């Protein structure tokens, strides 16, 4: 499972890499609801998640297994699908980044 966590870290590095930046950027940092004018965000999203938080948790050895890591990445996408109308540009970006994630997560050793 150290090996599986390394695979997860590789995925995380890929999600944060320039290769995917055109659609990954909304997920780099926590949603700043006040700054974005989304004053209902924290009434709708109980557990915010974003890639910088996933990165901090990986660096701190918070995740004990791949499944725990994947649950946080998927929570990040689910929050996006929950809050935004399905035709929002951010949702199209989420779907593309989640495709990157799911196909590489499936290659877990
Ligand atoms: C609010 C908003 C409006 C139009 C957008 N158009 C394209 C992509 C994201 C858009 C955004 C936008 C959306 C989100 C976001 C995510 C992810 N999940 O739910 C929401 C809501 C985060 C953002 N962060 C930023 C800036 C970096 C600080 N913009 C955005």
UniProtKB/Swiss-Prot annotation:
Subcellular location: Nucleus; Chromosome
Domain of life: Eukaryota
Mutagenesis or variant effect for residue 31 to A: Abolished binding to histone H4 acetylated at 'Lys-12' (H4K12ac)
Domain Bromo as annotated: residue spans: 1-108
The record's note on its domains: The first bromo domain specifically recognizes histone H4 acetylated at 'Lys-12' (H4K12ac). It also specifically binds histone H4 acetyl-methylated at 'Lys-5' and 'Lys-12' (H4K5acme and H4K12acme, respectively). The second bromo domain recognizes and binds histone H4 acetylated at 'Lys-5' and 'Lys-12' (H4K5ac and H4K12ac, respectively).
Subunit structure, interactors included: Homodimer. Interacts with E2F1. Interacts with (acetylated) STAT3; promoting STAT3 recruitment to chromatin. Interacts with CTCF; promoting BRD2 recruitment to chromatin.
Misc. remarks from the entry: Some specific inhibitors of BRD2 that prevent binding to acetylated histone are promising therapeutic molecules for the treatment of cancers or inflammatory diseases. ABBV-744, a small molecule, has been tested on tumors with success: ABBV-744 antiproliferative activity is mainly restricted to cell lines of acute myeloid leukaemia and prostate cancer and is able to displace BRD4 from chromatin. GSK046 (iBET-BD2), which specifically inhibits the second bromo domain, is a promising therapeutic small molecule for the treatment of inflammatory and autoimmune diseases.
Its biological purpose: Chromatin reader protein that specifically recognizes and binds histone H4 acetylated at 'Lys-5' and 'Lys-12' (H4K5ac and H4K12ac, respectively), thereby controlling gene expression and remodeling chromatin structures. Recruits transcription factors and coactivators to target gene sites, and activates RNA polymerase II machinery for transcriptional elongation.
UniProt similarity note: Belongs to the BET family.
Protein's name according to its UniProt entry: Bromodomain-containing protein 2
Organism: Homo sapiens (Human)
Originating gene: BRD2
